Structure 1
Amino acid sequence: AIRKKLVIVGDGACGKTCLLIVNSPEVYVPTVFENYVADIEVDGKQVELALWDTAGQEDYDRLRPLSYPDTDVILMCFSIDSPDSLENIPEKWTPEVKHFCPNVPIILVGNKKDLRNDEHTRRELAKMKQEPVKPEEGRDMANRIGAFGYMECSAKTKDGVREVFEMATRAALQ
């Protein structure tokens, strides 16, 4: 068997847990999610991808790094409806990941892509002089932080989700 560990990293509000859930329910959406192994096939290779959530660890800087050892790929997450969550990637999360996970492959993921053209979303952001994150911004940031690649998804419509974890698996197999 090929076994790889994924750790998802990012702001608490960016929907990290929802993303892991929708790779694993019209009948209920769980608030919390424990470690789970997904079976993913890329390029004729079967990989057991262990998914580690970091939700709830944002405010405990001493406890949080225990999630990092033996990581094969970091899923760096932000939400497209939150430019602030994107700025926290170079400001907070990338330095932390580079420190605790040196030479570990990173993929950059923009979640909640369905909210990009959401009128309610755009007016809420407009009040704060902001707009939803553009795809080019994600590609540029992926370059800046040395990510394997950037792609977007919606845990709501499940669009892009499968491809995200397939890209993560490819990065892990590097």
Structure 2
Amino acid sequence: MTEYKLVVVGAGGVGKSALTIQLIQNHFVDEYDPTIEDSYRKQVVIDGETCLLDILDTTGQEEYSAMRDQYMRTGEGFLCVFAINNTKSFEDIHQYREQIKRVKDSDDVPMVLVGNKCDLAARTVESRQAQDLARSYGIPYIETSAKTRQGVEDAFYTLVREIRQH
């Protein structure tokens, strides 16, 4: 069947795993559990199409920046995740976007900019400036909460549709 190779990238602790685990396992992991590299394959139906989501849940640890190239080449679509209460993770987005572009020899890679943790009231990244960023990349901006599940399916399914339109 059609498979979509999705990759979730971003600074440590933004909720990359929490987002993936909500989507695949319908619950919120509220605990400390840094990722090395986890893969999730799940058969779903999206807009009537039987397909396989092949999701790579990556690490934010900057020491492994050199090992990102290999999985970025293979990924068809990318969630670039920051947390709306972590300004540094939003500044870090640019470095992820640029490495993906460099490694993919592409400046129109399927990609969604994801503002996660939108359940938290203590926001430090205004939605408008994240939206301004996504507009300058030419990609959708979606806010999510892995805790409440708000926007989660939206972010992943939009990414799949970005791949279908590429």
> Structure 2 length as normaliser, TM-score?
0.84
What is the DSSP-based 3-state SS (H/G/I as helix, E as strand, rest coil) of the residue aligned with 1:68? Answer: helix
The residue identity in structure 1 corresponding to 2:97 is T
Q: Which of the numbers 51, 54, 57 marks the counterpart of 1:53?
A: 57
User: What is the alpha-carbon distance in structure 2 between the residues aligned to residue 27 and residue 6 of structure 1?
Assistant: 20
Q: How does the TM-score come out when normalised to structure 1?
A: 0.81
Aligned to 2:90: 86
Task: Label 1:76 to 1:27 Cα distance change in 2 as closer, same or farther (>3 A).
Answer: closer
State the 1:65 CA deviation.
Answer: 1.5
**C-alpha offsets along residues 112-153 of structure 1, whole Å, 9 cap, x if unaligned?**
0011x2xxxx3xxxxxxxx52222222111112222x11111
Distance in 2 separating the partners of 1:66 and 1:59: 15
> What is the percent sequence identity of the aligned residues?
33
Structure 1 CA distance, aligned partners of 2:49 and 2:132? 30
The 1:60–1:139 alpha-carbon spacing in structure 2 relative to 1, beyond 3 Å, is same
What are the superposed Cα offsets for residues 56-103 of structure 1, whole Å, 9 maximum, x if unpaired? 55312322212112221111110001121111112x111111111224
Check 1:27–1:67 CA distance in 2 against 1; reply closer, same or farther (3 A cut): closer
C-alpha deviation, 1:27, in angstroms: 9.7
Unaligned runs of 5+ in 1: 123-130
Which residue matches 2:135? 143
Q: Establish whether residue 133 from structure 1 lines up as the match of residue 137 from structure 2.
A: no
Contact persistence 1:23–1:162 (CA under 8 A): yes
Q: Any idea what SS the aligned residue of 1:77 has?
A: strand
Moved over 4 A (4+): 25-30
Aligned Cα RMSD in Å?
Answer: 2.2
Distance in 2, matches of 1:18 and 1:111, equals 10
Q: Where does residue 70 of structure 1 map in the other structure?
A: 74
1:8 matched residue in structure 2: 8
Match of 1:154 among 145, 151, 155: 145
Deviation at 1:38, TM superposition (A): 3.2
Amino acid at match of 2:47: D
1:114 to 111, 119, 135: 119
Unaligned segments of structure 2, at least 5 residues = none
Q: Distance in 2 between matches of 1:19 and 1:168?
A: 14
Alignment partner, residue 36 of structure 1:
40
Equivalent position amino acid for 1:156 in 2: K
- Please tell me the residue identity of whatever aligns with 1:68: M
- The size of the alignment, in residue pairs, is 159
Q: Which has the larger radius of gyration?
A: 1
CA distance in 2, matches of 1:151, 1:108: 6
| Contact 1:42-1:170 within 8 A present in 2 as well | no
